[model samples]
Target: CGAEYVRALFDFNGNDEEDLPFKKGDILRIRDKPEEQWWNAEDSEGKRGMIPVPYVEKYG
Candidate 1:
């Protein structure tokens, strides 16, 4: 998706700077889906990283 907001369905911790860390229920933006199994998202502060596609869903 080019631009959509999502709510994290599960907690996710990023071990590196390349991964966007988020907590369950956190509102995040779905950015580029650069891979089949991964989705790039942006944090509230504009932090960017690859997150699992299944860990989040379109926000209410």
Candidate 2:
């Protein structure tokens, strides 16, 4: 598990449980299992879901 978080680089459209669309400026809090390309995270809206790693920029 990792404590790192990332910011959404662009808006993505995922409707299933595995993924969700985030706004362009949304900040996402990373969840467990950072080993995978698709990571689970919670958005600024408090919605937790999966998102592709490449879609976000690393936050310090």
Candidate 3:
């Protein structure tokens, strides 16, 4: 149900549903790009999140 690798992050400013929960062990590989451009990120369960453009990158 998800990809085997990581990708780039895409910053998006929009409505956010507070109850959007992700599994604890789910891995997340964010886009290696400038943060001030987009909110891009990829989770282990194929779920993606916003990174606020200026902070989109591999966390760790």
lDDT of 1 by residue, 23-46 (tens): 888778877888786788887778
Candidate 3 ranges with C-alpha deviation above 4 Å: 1-26, 32-38, 52-60
Give model 1's TM-score versus the native structure. 0.76
Instruction: Quantify all predictions' global Cα lDDT against the true fold.
Output: 0.76, 0.75, 0.39
How many residue pairs collide in each prediction?
0, 0, 15
Full ranking by TM-score:
1, 2, 3
Worst 10 residues of 2 by lDDT: 31-40
Top TM-score: which candidate number?
Answer: 1
What TM-score would every model get versus the actual structure? 0.76, 0.73, 0.30
Task: Please report how far candidate 2 places residue 13 from its true position, in Å.
Answer: 3.5
Candidate 2 C-alpha lDDT tens digits along 9-31: 88876666557678687788887
Model 1, residue 15: C-alpha shift (Å): 2.5
